[PDB]
Write a structure and sequence with these properties.
The protein is an alpha+beta fold and 858 residues long. It is built from 32 helices and 24 strands. It is 36% helix and 11% strand. The structure holds 3 DNA and RNA strands.
Length: 858
RNA sequence: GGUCACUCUGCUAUUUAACUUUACGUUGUAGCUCCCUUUCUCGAAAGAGAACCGUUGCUACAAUAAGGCCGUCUGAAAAGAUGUGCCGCAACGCUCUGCCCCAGGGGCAUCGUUUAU
DNA sequence: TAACTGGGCCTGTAAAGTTAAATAGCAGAGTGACC
DNA sequence: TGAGGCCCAGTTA
């Protein structure tokens, strides 16, 4: 059983194609065997184009935020009890404070004029901690957050406002009518230092007025809780994110702000610099060499005049000849200079004289400040290595933030040769021998660490899966990469239009085609050479497969008929459903020299990768569920803003459907009619506010929404429900006893149910399943199923996408049918007479599968 | 000479991954508040007046995935005090396991890795 | 009275910082394999 | 910027 393969593969943003021929003698093809194609779905979010890992990272972030705020307030209450502000009777069973006032702003303002109750004081402290304002956290033209906070800081620094509470109450409430920020506005934010000042002033004033709980421990604890945050970077956070040195793989990259690395950059600039008059000898280089070290900034014109030069010869590679950008800095020794500045103003350094330190000491402090950012870590690396006065000055002034590509060892080895005049390549060759790649029968797993794009990463991991399936089944081959213009890097550019090279190069076989048995294709040529889309990727696959002058001929007609059974002419063709109609049809229609199918027979349909993850999440909107629980009526209630409302919501208003407020409904509907449904304009704030009967503003109204199912949240504390969302899988249930026909039932399983470890027993429209119902199987996203509509039908295998919770309907699509809007089909199955499972291998191994053990959730 | 690719340095644009925070928004519960269904009470009537529920606006507090776990102590156990406390919406893979498929060989995972105190 | 069907509507957000890394382009110094 | 979730109103067996 020997064959030989030169099968080509096509890469798309969501697709991968393959088609196998066997050119035998030397670069001269034969007829085809097993054409095929697989397809997946992108590593992005369809609507927004963000990364799926991005939503996950923001979930982690907000989880940590809420947890830390809860814990902060918890410790605040503990400190309140510990310092004797409140007694154990003032705390309820949940650990919350009973009769805690809801007037913290007014109390914060009155605390400058009178004494505060222990409960008023506790409310004030916890409110200050909870809304603890914005902290600069930074190492121009400000936006809106910074604008608002800076304006408020300037406002309480001028006149009638001693604290944010006074300014807040008086100005905010009398000018706007509310104190907090509303609907994305930032104009009421205070800087955390302003609130810290409020806290110190409040403690002092309360001590004046005879507050008993002005304890030092209490003040320290409240101030700590207010000010403390975790460091953004700590420990090995920077090191874990570093790359690998080019020559020394066991050694980390050197920091850009170190004497060694900065001088390495300087030497690269100097040695590589050439003057043109219609290189630079060691004396001129050595003149310029130590000039930037204490001369502040070395521009190119200063270098020219420093070495004399002329006006007749030039230093190559510079733009803007007319604008005379000769003061563009040739070199700035920024790390050395910043260290010197720091030690000059704060510590001890004569500005005229050059600050000095063991070159290794400069390297240590540069490394410590680039790799560690908090004072604890920095001193923990600089305590025993150097002494504390300079350490304090440097900790207070210096901040370095980038790296280079060569390790400190390799640099300390290279820089000497570069000072002597040798170049980077010459020094690297003299040291490492100017030679610095195992091949395998299977391509090993892809590395993701060499490119940002998850789209490309997933596309190429699936490309590797496909080519390794080719290598497994159809022997080892001689592959012809072909990546699309859309496939490389898309979204903004892709929406406007609407790494594997090296990996394969070094990690897999080539069978002696000179140097390489590969051909990197140029699909432009593919578009030219060919002399509402189905599985159309045969094109790029074999046009990649077949080192050309670029226009050689062979014949096509067969290939079209193998790609589509209805092809080689009009598409009303029968499209052979079996392999033997394929062989017969193609053979006889091409009758002539039977170069093609007979023994190879290959029916193709795209291999669509399935999604059987169990992870997921419910919807992020919280809705009232009091009626959903207490009276089991299948509705929820949610506020809707008037600027986003429509007549459907207006008719579903809570106080309209129960006739409570009919005239309010009439006025709102009247205004929305007056603008033809333009809710953004009918109820525009500060241009067209809506006023209820009696003069009260209306900004949003509660609207009822049909709630057949959902997940209940905060069950210990409230009646809240959220839409189910993220159906992870739906399990089938087969029952015959219709007294006659045999029926199907489908029960959906969501993510919150895989989290609560519950396995439902309610068919979408049907009701409870007993031991009478017979479980058939369970399917997920993008699984293949058999499909027999009714009495008479072709079995019509197709892939499954969605299930409808209302009636158990199924969104489907077949091979080459991918566009959801264009090509999904939606079949019902209460009477479907057979619905079956299947498996599709990478290539085309469409063998049915079946399991009868109902797989539970964990 | 031309082309392509690669190593290093400088600048520009874009993208990725990780972390610390703020301000919202949503739901609930209090309080004050705009309306308003219903039911009652005083009424001979005219009319008042209470109550639950709904609900407009503002303030506060709680929750903000569903689910699970940590360190530190007073000590015998129940526990009780306490923390700049910690994972959970992604991708990838086949050492441990489960399923599915064809003594191996795979695919998919609720298995494992990035991943943790 | 129960399914089937074509249609259709609602879905969490903005801002402020510390970082590392990848691609592309331009400029500068080299190298290799090809054509 | 889109697709999943799933209801709605009319029709049908």
């Amino acid at each position: 059983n020997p064959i030989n393969y030169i099968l080509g593969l096509a890469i798309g943003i969501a697709s991968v194609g393959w088609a196998m021929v066997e050119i035998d003698e030397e670069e001269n093809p034969i007829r085809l065997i097993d054409l095929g194609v697989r397809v997946f779905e992108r590593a992005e979010v369809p609507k927004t184009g963000d990364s799926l890992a991005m939503a996950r990272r923001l979930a982690r972030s907000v989880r940590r935020l809420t947890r830390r705020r809860a814990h902060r307030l918890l410790r605040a209450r503990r400190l309140l009890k510990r310092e004797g502000v409140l007694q154990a009777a003032d705390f309820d069973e949940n650990g919350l404070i009973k009769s805690l006032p809801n007037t913290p702003w007014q109390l914060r303002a009155a605390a400058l004029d009178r004494k505060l109750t222990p409960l008023e004081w506790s409310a004030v402290l916890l409110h200050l901690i909870k809304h603890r304002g914005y902290l600069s956290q930074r190492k121009k033209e400000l936006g809106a957050l910074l604008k608002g906070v800076a304006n408020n800081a300037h406002a309480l620094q001028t006149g009638d406002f001693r604290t944010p509470a006074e300014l807040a109450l008086n100005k905010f409430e009398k000018e706007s009518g509310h104190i907090r920020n509303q609907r994305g506005d930032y104009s009421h934010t205070f800087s955390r230092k302003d609130l810290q000042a409020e806290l110190i002033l409040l403690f002092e004033k309360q001590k004046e007025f005879g507050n008993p709980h002005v304890s030092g421990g209490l003040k320290e604890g409240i101030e700590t809780l207010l000010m403390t945050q975790r460091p953004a970077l700590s420990g090995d956070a920077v090191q874990k994110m570093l790359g690998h040195c080019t020559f020394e793989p066991a050694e980390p990259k050197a920091a850009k702000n170190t004497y060694t690395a900065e001088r390495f950059i300087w030497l690269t600039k100097l040695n590589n610099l050439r003057i043109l008059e219609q290189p630079l000898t060691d004396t001129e280089r050595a003149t310029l060499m130590d000039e930037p070290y204490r001369k502040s900034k070395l521009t190119y014109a200063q270098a020219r005049k420093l070495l004399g030069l002329e006006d007749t010869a030039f230093f190559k590679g510079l733009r803007y000849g007319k604008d005379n950008a000769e003061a563009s800095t040739l070199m700035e020794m920024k790390a050395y200079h910043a260290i010197s500045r720091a030690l000059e103003k704060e510590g001890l350094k004569d500005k005229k004289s050059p600050l000095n330190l063991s070159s290794e000491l400069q390297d240590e402090i540069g490394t410590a400040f680039s790799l560690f950012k908090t004072d604890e870590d920095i001193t923990g690396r600089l305590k025993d290595r150097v002494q504390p006065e300079i350490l304090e000055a440097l900790l207070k002034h210096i901040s370095f933030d980038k790296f280079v590509q060569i390790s400190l060892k390799a640099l300390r080895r290279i820089v000497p040769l570069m000072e002597q005049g040798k170049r980077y390549d010459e020094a690297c060759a003299e040291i490492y021998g100017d030679h610095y790649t195992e091949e395998k029968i299977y391509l090993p797993p892809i590395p993701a660490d060499e490119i940002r794009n998850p789209v490309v990463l997933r596309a190429l991991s699936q490309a590797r899966k496909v080519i390794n399936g080719v290598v497994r089944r159809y022997g080892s081959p001689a592959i012809h990469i072909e990546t699309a213009r859309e496939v490389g890097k898309s979204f903004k550019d892709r929406k406007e239009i609407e790494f594997l090279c090296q990996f394969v190069a070094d990690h897999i076989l080539l069978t002696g085609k000179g140097k390489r048995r590969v051909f990197a294709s140029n699909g432009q040529i593919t578009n030219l050479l060919r002399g509402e889309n189905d599985r159309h990727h045969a094109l790029d696959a074999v046009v990649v497969a077949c080192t050309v002058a670029m226009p050689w001929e062979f014949f096509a007609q067969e290939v079209m008929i193998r790609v589509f059974g209805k092809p080689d002419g009009k598409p009303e063709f029968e499209e052979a459903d079996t392999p033997e109609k394929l062989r017969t049809l193609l053979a006889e229609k091409l009758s002539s020299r039977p170069e093609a199918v007979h023994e190879y027979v290959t029916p193709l349909f795209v291999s669509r990768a399935p999604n059987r993850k169990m992870s997921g999440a419910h919807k992020d909107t919280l809705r009232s569920a009091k009626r959903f629980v207490k009276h089991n009526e299948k509705i929820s209630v949610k506020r809707v803003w008037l600027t986003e409302i429509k007549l459907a919501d207006l008719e579903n208003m809570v106080n309209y459907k129960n006739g409570r407020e009919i005239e309010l409904y009439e006025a709102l509907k009247a205004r929305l009619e007056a603008y033809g449904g333009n809710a953004k304009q009918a109820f525009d704030p500060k241009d067209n506010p809506f006023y209820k009967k009696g003069g009260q503003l209306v900004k949003a109204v509660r609207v009822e929404k049909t709630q057949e199912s959902g997940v209940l949240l905060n069950k210990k504390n409230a009646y809240t429900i959220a839409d189910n969302g993220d159906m992870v899988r739906v399990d089938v249930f087969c029952k015959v006893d219709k007294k006659g026909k045999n029926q199907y039932f489908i029960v959906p399983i969501y993510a919150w149910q895989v989290a609560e470890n519950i396995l439902p027993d309610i068919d979408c429209k049907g009701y409870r399943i007993d031991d009478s119902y017979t479980f058939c199987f369970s399917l997920h996203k993008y699984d293949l199923i058999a499909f027999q509509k009714d009495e008479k039908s072709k079995v019509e295998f197709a892939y499954y996408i969605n299930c409808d919770s209302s009636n158990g309907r199924f969104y489907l699509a077949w091979h080459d049918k991918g566009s959801k809007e264009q090509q999904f089909r939606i079949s019902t199955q209460n009477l479907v007479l057979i619905q079956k499972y299947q498996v599709n291998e990478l290539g085309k191994e469409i063998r049915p599968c079946r399991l009868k053990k109902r797989p539970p959730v964990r």
